[PDB]
Structure 1
């Protein structure tokens, strides 16, 4: 009790996306945009598709470093492009200054930056399964009201720095409420955003020799 509660079942902030600010070699960009997708890894998607409707707010945390695990004093900007705003296109973009895009300036040689994001959706709850069509075959069953906005990251810098910076985005689902429990997935996940499966059905249980064999 209180240990299998639905709140405790989704706690314990875990990795959701490993994005990499490329700035060296053949990728002299210096920025990268990572669209927020809770259903990133399968181990998380299967837990989320347990319920149909879900309402929560997240607490993102960024664990960044260089590739040799050092953390020099480089200065980073993390900008949260809200759902419905334009996303930047290069290192120097007018979008990097729109005061309606919240931004967090934190050096590498600092504790990880942490920011909460509220429940951002027009509906009453996020909806993993949408039996319907928007725009009243590659459009079926895809709800647009689950978008949580983007996260753009750039080094506050003039030219290229020649240092790749790996970033690890961690997320903590707070205040979880869920509705309409569903059967847990049984087949492999063939494709993102679609429940398609393989022609070769795999039994849910492992097959023994006889019905009278233990």
Structure 2
């Protein structure tokens, strides 16, 4: 729980507990007992909805797909949806197991195949690579139940990179890849239907659990433009001859006059 308010009477001190210095890079220790005369207040309030396990462990939508010809394909990434991407980019390194719930409006018999990295995924339904001996696969009927499975921490590191300031190739290379694109791939999920009846919309709701967040970062103050790319200059119109202008898409609102709000 949060600390209680301590009582404080009138104080005439020579060491001020309210004159600090912003330049030292340390935040203030100032409580309300320094500035005013407080009373005792029993504070039973908690921040148990603000820890990383409760802040991030909520089952956000990570990706949408649409079955075109009884087939969908989604590579596992938190990068297509901006609301979970902002919450992950609060931090630099995140180590989490993830449970994956599939919400499909298809009626019939579906198959998910978690293709691990390094092999060819099935390029269609009725493909031969759906018949696999070792690729973990999930058969389910979407009526009477949603499927759910935990993918553990598959990292090649102690944590996932939310941000990477590096490249996968040395200096002389030409197809260099900035960012977190080469550092980790969580496989992909290949969807197919063995029936035909219902709809085509497949939603993938992924919940991070057993989370360990490692370096805090500023929350993003601009809308995302691409994925794996951290850009924020939105190029809105490609056709018309205002093409090379770039919107900013930030959230800082303006007030008409300071000292009047």
TM-score category by the smaller chain? 0.7 to 0.9
- Report the counterpart of residue 135 of structure 1 in structure 2: 169
- Report the counterpart of residue 185 of structure 2 in structure 1: 147
Cα distance in 2 for partners of 1:127, 1:152 equals 24
Structure 2: which 5+ residue stretches go unaligned? 1-46, 234-245
- Does the Cα contact within 8 Å between 1:134 and 1:142 map onto a contact in 2? no
Q: How does 1:184-199 map to 2 (within 5 A)?
A: 184-198=219-233, 199=246
Q: TM-score, normalised by structure 1?
A: 0.84
- Does the Cα contact within 8 Å between 2:167 and 2:176 map onto a contact in 1? no
Q: Normalized per residue, which structure has more strand?
A: 1
- Does the Cα contact within 8 Å between 1:83 and 1:147 map onto a contact in 2? yes
- Does the Cα contact within 8 Å between 1:39 and 1:48 map onto a contact in 2? no
Q: Does 1:206 pair with 2:260? A: no
- Report the counterpart of residue 213 of structure 2 in structure 1: 178
Cα distance in 2 for partners of 1:212, 1:6 equals 37
Cα distance in 2 for partners of 1:150, 1:54 equals 20
Cα distance in 2 for partners of 1:123, 1:138 equals 21
CA RMSD in angstroms comes to 2.1
| Larger RCO of the pair (alpha carbons < 8 Å, separation 6+) | 1
What SS is found at the alignment partner of 1:172? strand
Question: Across the two proteins, how many residue pairs are aligned to each other?
Answer: 199
Q: TM-score, normalised by structure 2?
A: 0.70
CA offset digits 1:43-84 (Å, max 9, x no partner): 111111010000001111112223xxxx3xx22111100122
Larger radius of gyration: 2
- Does the Cα contact within 8 Å between 2:94 and 2:159 map onto a contact in 1? yes
Q: How does 1:100-115 map to 2 (within 5 A)?
A: 100-115=134-149
Cα deviation, residue 166, structure 1: 1.7
- Does the Cα contact within 8 Å between 2:155 and 2:184 map onto a contact in 1? yes
CA offset digits 1:14-53 (Å, max 9, x no partner): 222222222xxxxxx3211111111221111111101000
Cα distance in 1 for partners of 2:249, 2:126 equals 51
